[PDB]
Amino acid sequence: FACKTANGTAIPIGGGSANVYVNLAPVVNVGQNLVVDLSTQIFCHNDYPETITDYVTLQRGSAYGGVLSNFSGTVKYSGSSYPFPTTSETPRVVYNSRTDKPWPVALYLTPVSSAGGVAIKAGSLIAVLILRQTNNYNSDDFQFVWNIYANNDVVVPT
């Protein structure tokens, strides 16, 4: 079991960390959503499904810099939403195949009314999300730590 970003950053078997750079809508209005759909950028696969079945949770998610201070919101993980920053490990997702399969985590962030100026600086860390992979076969428990960075800039217009 390993994972890769869209543009080819790779976290190997056993876990590790990676940076993932994402494009954001340039304007979000107070009352509207800024979506971060990592399921278009983070992909995983079972490396021997013949015998093994891999289980994947979002162990933990945390907000940094801009999103940490001008935004509230949730994280949708497999059809269901949860508070973000996270308060609890999410349910398991089953990684079936040797075929690359999206990590289906997306953030929905709304700006607080005091969000004025540039809410998120470009090139800043906005989120860290810890992918935790166990299985049905041995005692393996590995964290795949993704550091989410912003490409462009987002402003919230007064």
Ligand X SMILES: Cc1nc(-c2cnccn2)sc1C(=O)c1cnc(N[C@H]2O[C@H](CO)[C@@H](O)[C@H](O)[C@@H]2O)s1
With CB under 6 A as the contact rule, the residue among 30, 43, 82, 140 that binds ligand X is 140
Taking 3-state DSSP, the helix, strand and coil percentages for the chain, each rounded to the nearest 5, stand at 5, 55, 40
Binding-site partner at residue 110 among Ni ion, ligand X, none, CB < 5 to 8 Å by type: none
With CB under 5 A as the contact rule, the residue among 17, 27, 47, 100 that binds Ni ion is 47
Q: Is 59 in the site for ligand X (CB under 6 A)?
A: no
- Only segment of 26-34, 40-48, 117-125, 149-157 that touches ligand X (CB under 6 A): 40-48
Residue owning tokens 């940076």: 19
Q: Is 106 helix (H, G, I), strand (E, B) or coil?
A: strand
Q: 123 or 137: whose CB is closer to ligand X?
A: 137
13 vs 10: CA distance, rounded Å: 10
Binding-site partner at residue 1 among Ni ion, ligand X, none, CB < 5 to 8 Å by type: ligand X
Q: Judge whether 33 and 40 are in contact, CB under 8 Å.
A: no
- Only segment of 33-41, 44-52, 67-75, 103-111 that touches ligand X (CB under 6 A): 44-52
In the complex, least distance from residue 32 CB atom to ligand X, rounded to whole angstroms: 40
Q: 11 or 156: whose CB is closer to Ni ion?
A: 11
Structure-block tokens of residue 88? 């609890």
94 vs 79: CA distance, rounded Å: 14
Sign of CA dihedral 21, 25, 31, 37: negative
Residue 99 CB partners (closer than 8 Å, separation 6+): 45
Please give the residue ranges that form the binding site for ligand X (CB under 6 A).
1, 13, 46-48, 51-52, 54, 135, 140
